[PDB]
Amino acid sequence: LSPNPPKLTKQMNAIIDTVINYKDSSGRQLSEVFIQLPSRKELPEYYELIRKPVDFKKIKERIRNHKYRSLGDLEKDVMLLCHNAQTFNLEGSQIYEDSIVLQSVFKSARQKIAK
Amino acid sequence: RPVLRSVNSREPSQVIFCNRSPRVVLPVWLNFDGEPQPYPTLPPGTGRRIHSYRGHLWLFRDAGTHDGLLVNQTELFVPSLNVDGQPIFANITLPVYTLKERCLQVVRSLVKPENYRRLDIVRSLYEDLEDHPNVQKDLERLTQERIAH
Amino acid sequence: MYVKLISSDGHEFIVKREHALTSGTIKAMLTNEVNFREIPSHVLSKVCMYFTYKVRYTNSSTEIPEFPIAPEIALELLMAANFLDC
Amino acid sequence: MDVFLMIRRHKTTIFTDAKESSTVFELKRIVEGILKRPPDEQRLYKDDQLLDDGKTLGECGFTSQTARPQAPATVGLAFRADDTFEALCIEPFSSPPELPDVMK
Ligand SMILES: Cc1ncsc1-c1ccc(CNC(=O)[C@@H]2C[C@@H](O)CN2C(=O)[C@@H](NC(=O)C2(F)CC2)C(C)(C)C)c(OCCOc2ccc(CN3CCN(c4cc(-c5ccccc5O)nnc4N)CC3)cc2)c1
Ligand code: NA
Ligand code: NA
Ligand code: NA
Ligand code: NA
């Protein structure tokens, strides 16, 4: 487990920062609830359903520790976060709608920072 | 697992909470283990379309005093599935309190709890004033009612 | 159809039997006249208004208004309500 | 719809309801059913003003907003004796005590 080049870690961090810092037109940070999973004691129901839990804390850690070897590997963990939130909280929940917007903000940020 | 709980249906249900009381309302959700959770408050006359699930148990209190309120003329609210995307409506009102209970509410609202035993009243009413309304009290009563189907 | 409730100062209140029966105490004591040696007129009139309010709004579909109580009658009204079991 | 009244004379208070659309005369008939005095033995008042028999309770100023179950409007009642109407006399209710210090 050897280090990614500096320019790739600079790319990854700037994409995730955009997603995390994104505010909507009302002025609300959509990432807020996605920073940190609830614990298995708080909400066992989440862990009976979701096989591969992940939050933005873990995604920032996986950047620091060079576990993502491509912008592609990063996207997969973010899409997974957003799909887990969609699977658990179903269509019709604010948190499902928030996760959809964040998928879009991610792809939009990676399109700008891969230029 | 207690008698009064939400079930983990994972079946979405759109609900409108409407406060037609002169109280600030605290919606209270019973979780999968019967434990009441507080949700954001509704000022008098306000309503909100909110997302819930089939078989999720709700009840409604004065946000300041925990005085109990009705929803569609009963104490518990449980959504069906929406038929054809129609939201379920929850009409939140005052009950008809007993006069005794309404008098306790007004004295409690005008007198700091330290000063309750400084009022010139029948002494048995000091205990009644201190027995503040709460969800856990009413939860146990509603549970006993359900035990008798 | 109607019963007489008499306050301590000798005010007579003619209310519907069905409305008076809101009071557990009154419901037991019922003849058609009821003498209250310890509830005065400014309290007993307000009790009668609670009876009207209760029968009107119990099991209604119209919005229910708050039953108002002035600070100055609240303590007496409490003791009345406590004695009258309503 | 419904208006909620206290009909008051001397130390007698009748709690009754009626319709906004019902007449002062129909109220006298309610009183006659209770106190066995005929309409022509009754004067009804609102705040010292004599109510005409043919007028509706709504027309006299008794509305759903001013005559509520929890705050009924007052109708004054005076009876005839020896072919003379008494002065309208409503005995006040008792006064509450001084508001205690601990209730502000
Ligand atoms: C505006 C308003 N005025 C008056 S009332 C009101 C209102 C009404 C409703 C609502 C919202 N509706 C509800 O809460 C509904 C009502 C009831 O039916 C339960 N209920 C659920 O949603 C539940 N869900 C379910 O049963 C399922 F989802 C199908 C299985 C449950 C509570 C278990 C969540 C509302 O919202 C305000 C805010 O309300 C909350 C705020 C914070 C918390 C505490 N926790 C909860 C878990 N949580 C999550 C994290 C992640 C995640 C994190 C990191 C990475 C990935 C992730 O996936 N994902 N999902 C989560 N749920 C974090 C916060 C709870 C409520 C206001
Ligand atoms: Na997750
Ligand atoms: Na559920
Ligand atoms: Na839902
Ligand atoms: Na009430």
Residue numbers in the entry:
A (entry chain A): 1376 to 1490
B (entry chain B): 60 to 208
C (entry chain C): 17 to 46, 57 to 112
D (entry chain D): 1 to 104
How do the authors describe this structure?
A key step in this process is the formation of a ternary complex where a heterobifunctional molecule induces proximity of an E3 ligase to a protein of interest (POI), thus facilitating ubiquitin transfer to the POI. Heterobifunctional degraders consist of two separate protein binding moieties (the warhead and the E3-ligand) joined by a linker. In particular, PROTAC 1, PROTAC 2, and ACBI1 are three degrader molecules that induce a ternary SMARCA2BD:VCB complex with quite different degradation efficiencies.
ACBI1 bridges the induced interface, forming contacts with both proteins. SMARCA2BD:N1464 maintains critical bivalent contacts to the aminopyridazine group of ACBI1, positioning the terminal phenol group for pi-stacking interactions with residues F1409 and Y1421. Despite differences in the linker compositions, the protein–protein interface induced by ACBI1 is structurally similar to that induced by PROTACs 1 or 218. A slight 1.7 Å twist of ACBI1 compared to the other two degraders, which can be ascribed to their minor differences (e.g. the ACBI1 linker has one additional ether group compared to the PROTAC 2 linker), results in a subtle swing of the protein in the crystal structure. However, the major protein–protein interface contacts are the same and the structural differences do not align with the markedly different degradation efficiencies obtained, suggesting that the corresponding (dynamic) ensembles of induced ternary complexes may be fairly different and therefore responsible for the degradation differential between PROTAC 1, PROTAC 2, and ACBI1. The resultant MSMs predict that the crystal structure of the iso2-SMARCA2BD:PROTAC 1:VHL system is 2.2 kcal mol−1 higher than its global free energy minimum, while the crystal structure of the iso2-SMARCA2BD:ACBI1:VHL system is only 0.7 kcal mol−1 higher in energy than its ground state.
